Design a protein around this nucleic acid. Structure first.
Length: 66
DNA sequence: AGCCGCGGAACAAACTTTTTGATCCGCAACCTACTGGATTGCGGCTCAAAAAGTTTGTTCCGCAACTGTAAATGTAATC
């Protein structure tokens, strides 16, 4: 069905393990705007994986510009 | 490029919890025996009054995603 190359890159990133890679994967498969047909089950899987991969991370302030 | 409801805020009258400045009243002191005058004085206790501390009803401030005819595009990478 010729999944776009950017979609394949995001899937590879999610397989490696990232939280945004699956965020922008359950919002790419849940709407028609991003350019791919909406699949609900395979978007729900990406949403669950994105939420599961958030644990263990620390939120810190990196830089600042006054 | 426009500006939805939501929730803090910047202000501003009302409650509300103490800071202060007298007034009083036992209360031991004199004085002498003891209500000694026709006396003072002195320290807890209480009084509203008012300069301080919340509490609560109103008014603007800000901000997001996308809009009405409208692209599925073999590979990688740029703004």
């Amino acid at each position: 069905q010729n999944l776009p190359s950017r979609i394949t890159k995001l899937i590879k990133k999610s397989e490696s393990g990232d939280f945004a890679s699956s965020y922008q994967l359950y919002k790419v498969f849940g709407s028609k705007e991003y350019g791919v047909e909406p699949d609900e089950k395979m978007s729900d899987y990406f949403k669950e994986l994105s939420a599961k991969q958030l644990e263990g991370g620390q939120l810190r302030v990196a830089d600042i510009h006054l």
